[PDB]
């Protein structure tokens, strides 16, 4: 319900098999580059090395995985806070900037409101957890051709994406005989 | 998250199938990755499909539907108040999509698919077995996997696969009566 | 329910079969009740939808409006 703003988040596992230390990063809207997760996790309040791994790894006998993250942890006890995770992202002008993006376009469904930070951490855990299940071959590539993760857009929805697009025009040509009325 | 997601689905399912939650909505519990997905989205495709729950007293896993219903529904053939939809609601029938299909077991004919295990006219084709005891919804009729154009071919099973696809582009280039008016 | 305003004239009731003949549009009117009753366009109608008068139409009623059943 509410636009077409499109908003693509990726979690790439930099690093091939063996290639040194398999770091994780990710990506975001209006942004310069990537980001190790650890930060961002710091940035949603999630801070303690490990109060994160919970967000991601869900059970604690999974060393394997764990370990797999061990070198991410490392890319950031160059940052041990919430305001300097916000940091990493260009002072007071640019921290705002990031407590935005991580409400306004970093995982928009969920919500865009204020407080709905752990709501996402968690997700971003999720992501990451399937992102490693899949690189540790305990799980399979994601299939791009399951009818199931596709839709059809019928007439509705389409009448519908113009209707908003012009109803948007009458709407504001009128914010104009109006600017020029004064009377 | 949810512990005892079992006692939940059930409930879910009785609720879409009673009619209190929409019948669109899909409702998938993966057991073994411990997700439970509920999807109301729009544009998803979906269907047949009739239902099975063991829901029998005097023996084994059955279809819910029955000569009873079917026969009142016919009922409603010569009267030309039993509609498809009431099948929907009295739960004989459910709508499935894709995703949800993943977690079932469908049966094909339902017949010769679940009457117990007990000669062969050599010209009948060769069916496989019954191997499966789990079924949860059985296919309405196989022919519907087809669409408007092929549904018109006399016999396409005895028939090589792309040919059938060609007649199906031609069928639409046939001449005749397009409309009474 | 669809209408149509011929220049220099009343608003006709609109009939699929009619528009098909004169190149007109089976579309209907768009009214919004804007605060401090008002139309802003029309809206092409899906025949045999909720507005299309053919949605409630009897057989005999069709032929009547010349419309294949």
């Amino acid at each position: 319900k509410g636009s077409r703003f499109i908003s693509t988040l990726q979690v790439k596992l930099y690093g091939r098999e063996g290639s040194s230390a398999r770091t994780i990063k990710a990506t975001l809207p209006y942004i310069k580059q990537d980001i190790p997760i650890v930060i961002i996790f710091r940035a949603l309040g999630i801070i303690p090395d490990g109060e994160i791994l919970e967000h991601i790894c869900y059970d604690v006998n999974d060393w394997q995985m764990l370990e797999m993250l061990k070198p991410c942890v490392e890319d950031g006890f160059v940052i041990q806070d919430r305001e300097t995770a916000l940091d990493f992202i260009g002072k007071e002008k640019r921290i705002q900037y990031a407590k935005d993006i991580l409400q306004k376009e970093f995982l928009p469904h969920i919500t865009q409101l204020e407080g709905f930070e752990s709501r996402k951490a968690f997700f971003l855990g999720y992501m990451i957890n399937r992102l490693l299940l899949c690189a540790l071959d305990r799980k399979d590539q994601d299939d791009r051709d399951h009818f199931g993760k596709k839709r059809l857009d019928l007439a509705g929805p389409l009448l519908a994406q113009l209707f908003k697009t012009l109803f948007k025009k009458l709407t504001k040509d009128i914010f104009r005989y109006m600017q020029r009325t004064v009377e | 998250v949810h512990r005892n997601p079992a006692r939940l689905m059930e409930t879910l399912r009785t609720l879409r199938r009673k009619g209190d939650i929409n019948p669109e909505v899909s409702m998938i519990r993966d057991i073994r990755e411990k997700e439970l997905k509920i999807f109301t989205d729009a544009g998803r495709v979906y269907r047949p499909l009739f239902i099975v729950e063991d829901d029998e007293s005097l023996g084994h896993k059955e279809l819910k539907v029955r000569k009873g219903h079917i026969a009142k529904l016919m009922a409603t053939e010569y009267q030309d108040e039993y509609t498809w939809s009431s099948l929907l609601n009295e739960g004989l029938v459910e709508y499935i999509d894709a995703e949800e299909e993943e977690s079932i077991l469908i049966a094909m004919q339902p017949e010769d698919l679940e009457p117990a295990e007990a000669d062969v006219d050599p010209a009948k084709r060769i069916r496989v077995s019954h191997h499966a005891t789990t079924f949860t919804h059985c296919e309405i009729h196989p022919s519907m996997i087809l669409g408007v154009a092929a549904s018109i071919i006399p016999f396409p099973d005895h028939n090589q696969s792309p040919r059938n696809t060609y007649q199906s582009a031609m069928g639409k280039q046939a001449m005749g009566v397009f409309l009474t008016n | 329910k669809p209408m149509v305003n011929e220049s220099d004239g009343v608003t006709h009731a609109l009939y699929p079969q009619e528009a098909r003949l004169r190149n007109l549009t089976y579309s209907s009117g768009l009214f919004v009740d804007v605060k401090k009753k008002v139309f802003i366009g029309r809206l092409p109608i899906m025949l045999r939808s909720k507005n299309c008068y053919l949605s409630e139409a009897t057989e005999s009623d069709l032929y009547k409006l010349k419309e294949c059943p």
Partner: peptide, 30 residues
Amino acid sequence: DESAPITAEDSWAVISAFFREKGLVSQQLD
């Protein structure tokens, strides 16, 4: 006899049923 199960044949009624109630283009109207 009411309770009793179905056979193949019988499913064509059920189809029948659907189709009368939705027709061939539901998808577009709906």
